[PDB]
């Protein structure tokens, strides 16, 4: 319980929702054979639905009055009540991958900017160089922090074009 939320394990609405979904799937399954293709597909869907509901209830997710899982997006609140995998951990994972792609693109652009013909390098990508920079982008946090503390990650305001006010 965080904000009046009940765990999905003890939520009656959650169980009723699972029961209703499985019931609808079985109702659709009743109009087929026992080993036909549609019957097997419906059985697989039923198994997946049951596994999903069981996993959600076992993972400790919080359910509201409507019986659906709710996510806690607040450090500390999610860390002390065991909900860090809702938004905190996904935030870290995203930030890492997003920074990886961004750093790889930045390095490729800066590397090809020194070539005699950079526009062609932009429309016709250098596959080996792009591959090497994509691999190097995995250490983007360390490289970015080093460049920031080094002062080479920024451009002087006096060297950037600006409008005549």
């Amino acid at each position: 319980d965080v904000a009046g939320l009940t765990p999905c394990s003890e939520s009656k609405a959650f169980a009723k929702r699972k029961k209703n979904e499985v019931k609808a799937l079985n109702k659709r399954l009743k109009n087929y054979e026992a080993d036909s293709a549609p019957a097997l597909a419906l059985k697989a869907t039923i198994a997946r639905t049951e596994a999903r509901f069981d996993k959600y209830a076992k993972q400790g997710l919080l359910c509201g009055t409507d019986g659906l899982p709710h996510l806690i997006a607040d450090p500390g609140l999610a860390l002390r009540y065991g909900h860090a995998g809702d938004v905190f951990i996904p935030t870290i994972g995203f930030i890492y991958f997003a920074g990886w792609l961004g750093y790889a693109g930045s390095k490729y652009l800066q590397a090809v900017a020194a070539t005699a013909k950079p526009i062609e390098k932009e429309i016709i990508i250098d596959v080996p160089l792009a591959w090497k920079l994509l691999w190097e982008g995995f250490g983007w946090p360390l490289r970015a922090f080093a460049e920031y503390k080094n002062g080479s990650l920024m451009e002087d305001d006096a060297k950037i074009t600006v409008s005549p006010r």
Partner: protein
């Protein structure tokens, strides 16, 4: 002798009007006559009109 920077010297634009304000360009030629804007500067960044060269005065450019 000759006024302004020599040909092929990197210069920075000081005219806020110019599309290349605060940007560097190469001095292509400098006219040695009483011309208001005798410094010809070429750029690697085309403007909105697709032009990459412009004329500037002696006080509108800074070496390096």
């Amino acid at each position: 002798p000759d006024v302004g920077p020599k040909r092929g010297t990197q210069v920075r634009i000081l005219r806020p009007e110019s599309y290349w304000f605060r940007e560097t360009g190469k001095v292509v030629s400098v006219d040695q006559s009483g011309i208001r804007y005798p410094v010809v500067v070429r750029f690697e960044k085309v403007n909105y009109a697709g032009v990459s060269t412009n004329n500037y005065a002696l006080d509108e450019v800074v070496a390096a």
